[PDB]
């Protein structure tokens, strides 16, 4: 990744919070987003640097760009693409009941394309969810289509606590509660979330953890065969993104 000096960035309005991060609008000597990691253990900063490294080595129409990393005292900052309309989950809840199925199918295909690209390079995202899908274009006007960018996955899944992994249910693959196969589950859970206008299935941390421990399966979408195949507890039985992209 590219090293960004603190003199090259300007921190503006708070946008929201991610896992161990605060996300702000900013300027780069370009409008950007600044993902400020909390003062953290070296294992967490390393998992954050691994994400910056992964996203700086890939290039895809539907993957958000990473400008680089800035170290500002105890704060690690990932300088990433400012995407015009922000997260898909927020937008879906605001537009609940007025998002057509054809619009949702375009998003699913664009997301499956980004994930097929990663799968072919044997790279894991590990945080596929509506919150990490950003809208560059809304596709509300006649003759237009939405355009998504899959955000960086933030602090790597391998560095998170059990409590943080439970907070990720239902996007978290069940085998991760105690491989590219995990993104097939994240993809399936994101299709449910999109189908339900940003209302993902599953509640308290104990109820979510009990759901996976008891091997219960997620609700069917209101995409039924595809979610049923992606959301299986057997990782090797999940279809490839080549097959998913064909089935879509
Ligand atoms: C207008 N643009 C954007 C808004 C936004 N808001 C946001 C909204 C919540 C609820 C949470 C977080 C972490 C950010 N995030 N974002 C990103 C990104 N998180 O990578 C990239 N561009 C944008």
From Swiss-Prot:
Stretches assigned to the Protein kinase domain: 9-248
Result for mutant: residue 125 to R: In a colorectal adenocarcinoma sample; somatic mutation
Post-translation changes: Phosphorylated.
Domain of life: Eukaryota
GO molecular function, one term: protein tyrosine kinase activity
GO-annotated cellular components: cytoplasm; cytoplasmic side of plasma membrane; cytoskeleton; cytosol; extracellular exosome; extrinsic component of cytoplasmic side of plasma membrane; extrinsic component of plasma membrane; interleukin-12 receptor complex
Single GO BP term: type II interferon-mediated signaling pathway
Keywords: ATP-binding, Kinase, Nucleotide-binding, Phosphoprotein, Repeat, SH2 domain, Transferase, Tyrosine-protein kinase
Modified positions (Phosphotyrosine) in chain numbering: 24
Tissue: Observed in all cell lines analyzed. Expressed in a variety of lymphoid and non-lymphoid cell lines.
Stated role: Tyrosine kinase of the non-receptor type involved in numerous cytokines and interferons signaling, which regulates cell growth, development, cell migration, innate and adaptive immunity. Plays both structural and catalytic roles in numerous interleukins and interferons (IFN-alpha/beta) signaling. Associates with heterodimeric cytokine receptor complexes and activates STAT family members including STAT1, STAT3, STAT4 or STAT6.
Family: Belongs to the protein kinase superfamily. Tyr protein kinase family. JAK subfamily.
Subunit details: Interacts (via FERM domain) with JAKMIP1. Interacts with PIK3R1; this interaction is important for cell migration. Interacts with MPL/TPOR.
Recorded disease: Immunodeficiency 35: A primary immunodeficiency characterized by recurrent skin abscesses, pneumonia, and highly elevated serum IgE.
Protein name, UniProt field: Non-receptor tyrosine-protein kinase TYK2
Name of the coding gene: TYK2
Full-sequence portion shown in this chain: 581 to 866 of 1187
């Amino acid at each position: 990744f590219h090293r960004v000096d603190q003199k090259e960035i300007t921190q503006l309005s708070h946008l929201g919070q991610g896992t161990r991060t605060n996300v702000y609008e900013g300027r780069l000597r370009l409008r950007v987003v600044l993902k400020v990691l909390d003062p953290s253990h070296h294992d967490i900063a390393l998992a954050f640097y691994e994400t910056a490294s992964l996203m700086s080595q890939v290039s895809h129409t539907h993957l958000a760009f990473v400008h680089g990393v800035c170290v500002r005292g105890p704060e690690n900052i990932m300088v990433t693409e400012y995407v015009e309309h922000g997260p898909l989950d927020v937008w879906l809840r605001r537009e609940r009941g007025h998002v057509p199925m054809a619009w949702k199918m375009v998003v699913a295909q664009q997301l499956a394309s980004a994930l097929s690209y990663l799968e072919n390079k044997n790279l894991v995202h590990g945080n596929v969810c509506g919150r990490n899908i950003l809208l560059a274009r809304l596709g509300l006007a006649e003759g237009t289509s939405p355009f998504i960018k899959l955000s960086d996955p933030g602090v790597g899944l391998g560095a998170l606590s059990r409590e943080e992994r439970v907070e990720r249910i239902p996007w978290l693959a069940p085998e991760c509660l105690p491989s590219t196969a995990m993104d097939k589950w994240g993809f399936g859970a994101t299709l449910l979330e999109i189908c339900f206008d940003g209302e993902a299935p599953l509640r308290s941390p104990s109820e979510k953890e009990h759901f996976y421990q008891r091997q219960h399966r997620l609700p069917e979408p209101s995409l039924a065969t595809l979610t049923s195949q992606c959301l299986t507890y057997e990782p090797t039985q999940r279809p490839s993104f080549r097959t998913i992209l064909r089935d879509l």
